[PDB]
RNA sequence: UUUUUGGUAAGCAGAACUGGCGAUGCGGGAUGAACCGGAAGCCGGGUUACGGUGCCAAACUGCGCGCUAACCUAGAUCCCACAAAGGGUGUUGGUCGAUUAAGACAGCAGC
RNA sequence: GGCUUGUGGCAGCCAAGCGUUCAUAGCGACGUUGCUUUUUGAUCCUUCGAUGUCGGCUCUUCCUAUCAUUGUGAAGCAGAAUUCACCAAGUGUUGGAUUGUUCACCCACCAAUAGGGAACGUGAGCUGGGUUUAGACCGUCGUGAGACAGGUUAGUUUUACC
């Protein structure tokens, strides 16, 4: 099995990423990252596969003005694979889930990082291409 | 209030070779030889003939308290080389059986499955002490030796190695406990 | 399940005790004074409570 | 110091009698205007006051009895630089009462 | 800063009662003994030929009256969680909205988001939002000049080479 190795963190708090699911939300505004113990003055940051707390700044009214967990599926900041290759996506994206990691939506638009798929089997089930 | 003279005496058996010099007592018997250093006692040891006499002169009540302690220790040495000491322990468990593995010529024991834990508890017997699993009784250990302190201390090491933690010990009574303090 | 004889032996070490009301030290059942120096060898002792 | 008012109290404020400091060094209190001793020309000798005599540091590890053992930094000298109620089967003295060779107490034994 | 500790904060003793039963697992009424100088007062001993006067930022060190972490005792401790107490200051104690704030409050993360000292640490280290010069406005007060531990806006932060 094993746990996921560290990745470059490219999405600090206040980062606004695209919503890659069909829940009706168009973007996700990151307000915190789970598992961050932190450092003075250091902004919490997330990478692909990290669960974050976010708010929908643009989307269906039923999803706005609310705090919900989400999972990052793509990021623009390059990160190093163990085989020495640096990867990155064209944009930053995430999907809304519940505290147990179950997707709120039912479909995912675009590819998702392999790191996120391994940690979240529910997200991988609804994914199209896992890279 | 210092009493002028406090003295106590004990009888030395016929088949014991007791040697005393400068509060260094050596006892030899059929089972072996035992020696204890009593230089920390401010007493006067004397063999009169066989009997052992211990005197305290102008000693406070605390000082005279060591007179009986010295005799009891000497008596234990005599019994150690004549009859020996046998401490029996019993495994106590509710659900998980306690598995014991004797090894190294009965000079070591390993406890496994204590409350289902995967950690292996290893205890090494002290000098002159041998541990053997009893066959007549179910889940019983037998520790034998000449020195009561070493045999009794070996049993204590086993008992304290199997303490339950983070639980109500009143209900979780699992452990290894001394059931009999006797002699061979 | 534990045999009645064995559980009586176990409770000799874990249940039959006196507890100091000042320092909570475990004392032998016939104790009259606590052996601890922090409480001043207090004589205020209580039995160790049983399971109901 | 003592008497003494206001104030929870204050190295706070205000009075009474005397002394002291201020105006004054000197010996002691490690150090200190007021505490203890004592007041002074420049010197030699002798003896003391308070305070001291293991080293710092002049003078005993002097001659005697007991108490204390501090695994809390035991304790160590007027003013003075702190400690309380309440506790200890720590140890040492004392006071009152009860029991005991007709056999107590502990344990052991079947009252 | 110093004396003091009323007030503020922290702790103990007695045991009426609470705790289904049960004074003392956990609590402690009526009383009573203390500690602390991270509160505010009291005083006016030092400084008025001047010790730069709020807070934040930055940075180090120290305390323990321990929030989390290591080892344990107790429980009205089955388990899980929680509570009381002991040794313990080695390591850590965060990201944000509003406010000049200290304080506070909420959102979120976290093993935990404990409490304090160092001239209420720290302005020839910064910053200058506030307070606390001169301009100006309002309200109330005053016949008026003007006043306001009321509100408002603009207002030079010097020097090290000893
Ligand atoms: K955090
Ligand atoms: K006494
Ligand atoms: K006070
Ligand atoms: K001044
Ligand atoms: K400076
Ligand atoms: K301007
Ligand atoms: Mg910051
Ligand atoms: Mg539990
Ligand atoms: Mg005055
Ligand atoms: Mg004058
Ligand atoms: Mg002095
Ligand atoms: Mg002379
Ligand atoms: Mg001497
Ligand atoms: Mg007293
Ligand atoms: Mg009260
Ligand atoms: Mg000046
Ligand atoms: Mg100046
Ligand atoms: Mg200066
Ligand atoms: Mg402490
Ligand atoms: Mg329960
Ligand atoms: Mg610390
Ligand atoms: Mg703001
Ligand atoms: Mg202060
Ligand atoms: Mg300051
Ligand atoms: Mg400065
Ligand atoms: Mg400046
Ligand atoms: Mg400043
Ligand atoms: Mg300004
Ligand atoms: Mg102005
Ligand atoms: Mg008018
Ligand atoms: Mg202004
Ligand atoms: Zn105690």
Short mmCIF file of C-alpha atoms (C1' of nucleotides) in Angstrom, two decimals, chain E residues 54-61 117-123 125:
data_model
loop_
_atom_site.label_atom_id
_atom_site.label_comp_id
_atom_site.label_asym_id
_atom_site.label_seq_id
_atom_site.Cartn_x
_atom_site.Cartn_y
_atom_site.Cartn_z
"C1'" C E 54 -0.36 53.21 23.13
"C1'" G E 55 -0.42 48.95 20.03
"C1'" G E 56 1.46 45.95 16.37
"C1'" C E 57 5.82 43.96 13.68
"C1'" U E 58 10.54 41.67 14.53
"C1'" C E 59 13.92 38.71 17.90
"C1'" U E 60 16.02 36.18 22.00
"C1'" U E 61 15.86 34.41 26.59
"C1'" G E 117 8.11 37.82 33.04
"C1'" A E 118 12.48 40.40 31.01
"C1'" A E 119 12.20 49.33 32.71
"C1'" C E 120 3.57 47.14 31.76
"C1'" G E 121 11.29 43.41 27.20
"C1'" U E 122 12.05 45.80 22.51
"C1'" G E 123 11.03 53.84 18.53
"C1'" G E 125 15.09 48.50 15.37
#
